[PDB]
Design a protein around this ligand. Structure first.
Ligand SMILES: [Mg+2]
Ligand SMILES: [Mg+2]
Ligand SMILES: [Mg+2]
Ligand SMILES: [Mg+2]
Lengths: 525, 524, 486, 499
């Protein structure tokens, strides 16, 4: 009949050991020399099914890895930008060796539910993985098309034909993982199934995520983001692919953090140094239960914050030492304090301060909590480096959002991470949020990427360039077209296309009309 | 107890009666003064369910209808181009009053399966409606975004704020219908559900459909395309909306037709006039059943075709008249034959030539059929005019593809149609497949749309302008960007956006970040 | 020249005022007599666009409202179960007046990405709203099919035909909202556009959400769940629909809470009473029993201060006392707090959610009538006309109740005010049962099993689907065709 | 910088050559011994891209082939039925080695647009492949879940656990290809990407696709359907997979055909033998049809030739084009026969044909070289007819696998005695019908239990759930009764603990 087991019991153990050995051998590849796996080959194989699946995503990540390995070793950089759709990706393939898929661009132009909006990662998590597939399936198509044209013409005739590399690895945005760890693994699975060569996940909290240059970004504990990076690697291992994992931190300008449970975040959590105040939350509640609204509540909250005199604990300590009237050598004590207290938890920092003769210090990080229950933090490059260093073992590349295209801070960040992991690859957001004309003169704009590459930033990208380029020409053309009709098409579009040799100008051929026509003749012939 | 009927059997008839009355009242509206409906209000209402649904697409078509009514009457035109995605649509809204969604563009950039390819209408049929929805949901969002910013500001400060009309009616490509009449109705249903103000369907056959300017187009019989147009209207009626139905004919350049069953197509079907030849099918068969396969079989067909001496029937008749000594008045016989046989079936035409004393005409349009069984046909503007006239009662606007931006032929096509229906709106494809620099000087390029508007082409569009504009800026920026890094971004993109005052340059605000933040606060 | 404003400047204020007036008029309807809106009609309108859209969803929620108003007032109840797909829905339509779309069933049979998994609300949030569309579009189709049949047939023969009400209002699972408040509004927008008559949202946290009868369920603060419920009403108001919002609380068996920020939650947060103990988190590198966790009151009562401490924060609670409690040490690794759930806790939460919910549901460990009575009475002691909903969970082992009590359970709960009841996974279970039974028999005796276990039974019960072609709408579509070419 | 070619010009030729070699090697495998490929390996490779992709569809394809090969050789059969969704597929997996995905069922319950309707193949063509993915992703998940459970337990205890083969090969409905040849290859590409082990395609016309037992089905020419089967194999070859291609013919009951261009169709096309009549179209336009039809005295050519005579004609006229048949008939003294198959045409332009089993055998034999299995859509469960069809096809291709659709509509209660009902499948398998299926069983079982339960539930409430659902599940040991474990809660909980 039709009854049979998935696997004959007699062979279950054999197949398991054999597969386990294969994974341990795989993990030995140089690809993983910087990767820390807090789990065993046995644990991973034990989660796999009986049918091994191969993914073209794997090939692309291997390709991407070969590229970034070179770039970093030579202190050069591969740079690209956020691609919106297929037309754009086929043109980018001629000059850029990678492709970036922006979640910001996806919210405004590719939500799988078609409901657009600001960059809040609040679209269905199928969104970015579907954009990857949208571009990848188009890349695979134009590759087949072109190979067909090339192999179809006499060898001596090929020098005239194009030879574009359409299979440019795609790095996609995973936002914060769209939920818990089980969601992170499912998202990663889609990304691999859809073709991503690599993905990036940020240490922000889902439900509140904002674009890197917004005020009020909320972070998650360092341990939680590490879990996310581990979950991604675990899912990739289960699927047997080399998907690159990129860690992004928003600790530079972040002002909030979900919990203070992780001692590594203690040094940066703001505490109320005023013993007389009642909790902000209590104050704010009473304020609302009294009709206070808008600017009132704000004023009431603003005053509380000021009287609170919020500071990181080390600052609270240094201020006490310097204001003292009994402590001998304030500079010496403060100096010894800061040195020993670095990276210590709050309890240990307090213990250190007391051992150095400083009196007890009032420091309360609960009273300043927001109505949601979040804690306030004073981030910055130092906070960013701390996090990057902690993520490093679980990240193939690290990225830190910044406020301006500041070379020095990029240097500061890089040297900070490299002090611990000299070979850690770095990625950088050449954000269009920065007013580049105001930020730096042309000559420096022209060398910025190169200068950053010298620092280890081997992969750089202009997040929203696709959006802006499409908007600019659309605004320009639609206007001209409305003013002078077809004169605008020939002048602003068709002629420039010819002069530049844009292959799309010959739309029929560019679309694969001949390619499919030959597929047809082959079947009917 | 949870058992109850959908509707009380006692009131079923009263409700049906009232609905029918409404449908009839709706049909008397001037919106339908040119519309021929081969079915009754009772038939339509009998296909409806018990829960009436209203679609924003209906509002969009009414808006479209008002716009096109105005243009045609003033002999002006609204013109737009094929929009690729949301970023593009929000910019078009500033200068263009309508939006076009191309099936061609959808093939290379928007198939529902993500499998791209050439314009063959072979992607899943949800492809174009989904693109309509993609753009329509974005327009809706941006209209919300802008109203909030405007209403949130003091009346006195609004003059400084943008006042873009994002709700530009969308006209979509329904290809040939993606299957039979039931497929046509399902397609129209999704278009209506996705926000389409109008859709266009062409007289090519699905499966062999292709680019409007590609050689070898295959036509379906006139009756078939009319059925499609009627199917569209019926579905719109069932759903209670004013969806515009635009008919497109590919007869100007088409060389094939699927069948010879429709007498209206007989005047154009090509027949072999050499009684010594054997059917092309048998020849090619016998030929391939012995190697030769390749360019040899090709040439073998060209020769047959040459020997066949193919002609439209009227010409075959006239050729026999001018070579029959038994005919005393050849000029009179020919003229009389042409006058009477005009628009008649082959059988009627043969009966006419017969009555006029014309000898037996050897004409065989079956022998020239392709291996797929397709008949040959000589189309052209005259064939297209004939089809447009036959489609007009079931089409809100008519479109005839052309080989070149030829004003004279466009005027010829318009006159042909207006001779019978002087108020028939027309549509024109300002094709980017045409070499404009080579077609007409710049000053004439700028008057072209207006010239065409004077003829009644009240709605015109550059099918693939979105593709090309996007390709251009992408090639240019990507190249420069790979050459001078960030210098190119500020020089070619950011600074120009600033100069031009492009709202997107402040992407956060443009994306609706302020709008959602206020939604947030409202909910506290 | 194709350039024109969205709205002429001189009309904007007049259009706003009029629309704001319409909304205030709408909100005065008795449908909203229990509804508390912490926002104004003006705030809502200034969030709308210039094109009003009407949804068949609004019609269904109105029909649903009319149904539940009746059930509650008569102290009866409508009961249904989770539906899997169209075939099942066309059959349920004949006997039950509402339809339920389970998030549990959706995870195992309908993720938008096709990746199955346990009930963790970790599929793309598009999942459940799509399942609603799936069934609703099918309901609409069959409504058309049947109307065509009845209307086209001789009036004297209509009594011999079916007259099924396929338009049975659907209530769907919105899990915990799938993220932040903006996600909640987007999800609601989807449910409304897809056909939902009402949706339910629970006070668990995304990422940790588990099915009602799971172990350590984690709750969000009372205030956070209220925001979710207000976000839902807010989206419905923007869209102009009457969508029902059902509040579910998992407080009866929850053991953890994300934060202690809300004072209404203080009365249930467990704190260590052993000064000798060091933080639990530190030890994890048991402590519990030794910690002697207690609620502040069960620690203060060691006379009648409880009467003035009721519903007070810990700060205010301590104050009352004067005239050792530490809840930080017990915190989990994630930073969560320990809490003692229970009916009392659920009642407290139910009461806080009430002004923002059309119906309230409290998960229970067993189908316990007495507990259901206690919950109902606790809520009603404050909001006597608050509709309640109940999960006739297939997770329970009914034989927990004798056959005779099984038959009256729904009726008894109905007396308590549980006007809407549902078996979450009945759809999954019925399909599974018949599938196993049939596939097994079919593998043994071939077509004999089909004639005996399926075909013959269908014809005897007169299942309309047995006439597959007619059922699927073959005659309906065939007529549509003849009408177009006729 | 970042510019580089897709492939170095100095390597293209060699890679091409090596890949072309691999394809020829692949095609020499026994899997393809019965397969005719009207194209070259060089033609296929020249259509591929530079990135090779592996599909689990292929592994399943191989598995299915191994199964069917065994079945046919032993004259046994694998049989299954149309599956609706994941729940059903996990139960079917215990007792059935294959899974069928019905287009009919997909139309009433799975259109990718959610718009249901009768079986007319007019849903978006992503419908069926999407259903395949729906079931396959579910199979893959449960396979992992169970593997983890089994491996996580000590060997000595595994015999107490389930060991269901969830990876049951899925055969799916491709209708008529959903349009032209370019659509056929696209639809085939999706099926392969989605996980199909095999697909079947029928010889009806797409715009008028009807379900098997329908009134007037329209057929495409033999050559057109062969083009579809070849298009399927080509796409499979391009993708490097072993996808099974099943050819279905509706010629047993079809009454129309799009065109008379294919000579192999000539012996079945009905013609008018009445010379005094005007074409039907002309008649209809001048405005009765049945009237014309009757006065037309429609017959197949061979029959028209006979009547004329009243004759070795039938012998030499076998499988001959009309122009040949005519040439034959006359060479035997027979007078010019009046035959016109263009006058009977429908208003859509369709020709009339008299189908039947002989017509179906003809088509099946014509498709055989391009099909891994052949199926003749039939309505009545007639053992003798099935025998007639199989012997007809086997007379030419004795090792040609056959498929069979077990009528879900016909009344089996009176169709044959119970004994005969139980042996029907076994008897067909003996004829070479190595894979059989009940297209709509999934629909009916779900429909049956739903009506029964919804009714009982509305009558006795929870009592009904205990009596008709929960108790039986427990007594039958249905794993789904413990929904949490079954859904994979422990698998995911453990997955999370690992992280
Ligand atoms: Mg982002
Ligand atoms: Mg088109
Ligand atoms: Mg749930
Ligand atoms: Mg089918």
């Amino acid at each position: 009949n039709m009854v049979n087991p998935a696997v004959e019991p007699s062979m279950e153990d054999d197949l398991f050991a054999r597969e386990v050995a294969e994974v341990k051998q795989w993990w030995s590849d140089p690809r993983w020399r910087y990767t820390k796996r807090p789990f065993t080959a046995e644990q991973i194989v034990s989660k796999r099914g009986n049918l091994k699946i191969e993914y073209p995503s794997n090939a692309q990540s291997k390709k991407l890895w070969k590229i970034l390995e070179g770039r970093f070793q030579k202190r050069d950089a591969s740079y690209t930008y956020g691609c919106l759709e297929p037309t754009m990706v086929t043109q980018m393939a001629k000059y850029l060796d990678t492709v970036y898929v922006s979640g910001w661009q996806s919210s405004s132009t590719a939500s799988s539910s078609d409901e657009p909006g600001p960059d809040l990662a609040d679209y269905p998590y199928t969104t970015v993985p579907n954009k990857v597939s949208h571009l990848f399936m188009a890349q695979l198509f134009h590759d087949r098309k072109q190979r067909h044209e090339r192999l179809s013409a006499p060898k001596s005739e090929r020098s005239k034909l194009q030879n574009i590399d359409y299979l440019r690895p795609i790095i996609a945005d995973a936002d914060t993982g769209h939920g818990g760890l089980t969601a992170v693994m499912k998202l990663t699975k889609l990304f691999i199934e859809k073709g991503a060569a690599g993905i990036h996940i940020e240490d922000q909290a889902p439900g509140t995520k904002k674009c890197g240059h917004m005020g009020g970004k909320v972070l998650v504990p360092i341990s939680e983001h590490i879990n996310r990076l581990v979950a991604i690697r675990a899912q990739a291992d289960i699927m047997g692919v080399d998907l690159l994992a990129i860690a992004r931190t928003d600790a530079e300008a972040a002002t909030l953090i979900t919990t203070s449970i992780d001692p590594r975040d203690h040094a940066f959590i703001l505490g109320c140094t005023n013993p007389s105040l009642q909790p902000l939350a209590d104050l704010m509640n009473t304020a609302e239960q009294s009709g206070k609204t808008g600017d009132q509540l704000q004023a009431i909250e603003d005053e509380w914050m000021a009287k609170a005199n919020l500071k990181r604990f080390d600052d609270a300590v240094v201020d006490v030492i310097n204001s003292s009237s009994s402590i001998r050598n304030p500079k010496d004590v403060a100096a010894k304090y800061l040195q020993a207290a670095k990276g210590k938890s709050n309890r240990e920092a307090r213990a250190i301060a007391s051992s150095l003769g400083v009196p007890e210090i009032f420091f309360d990080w609960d009273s300043p909590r927001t109505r949601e229950g979040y804690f306030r933090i004073k981030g910055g490059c130092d906070c960013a480096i701390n996090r990057a260093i902690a993520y490093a073992p679980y990240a193939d590349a690290i990225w830190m959002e910044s406020k301006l295209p500041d070379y020095e801070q990029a240097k500061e960040f890089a040297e900070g991470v490299h002090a611990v992991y000299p070979e850690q690859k770095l990625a950088y957001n050449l954000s269009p949020s920065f007013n580049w004309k105001t930020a730096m003169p042309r000559d420096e704009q022209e060398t910025y990427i190169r200068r950053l590459a010298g620092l280890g930033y081997c992969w750089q990208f202009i997040t929203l360039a696709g959006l802006h380029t499409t908007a600019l020409i659309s605004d320009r053309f639609a206007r001209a077209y409305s003013e002078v009709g077809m004169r605008a098409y020939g002048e602003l579009v068709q002629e420039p296309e010819m002069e530049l040799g844009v292959d799309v100008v010959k739309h029929q051929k560019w679309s694969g009309a001949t390619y499919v026509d030959e597929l047809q003749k082959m079947v009917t012939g």
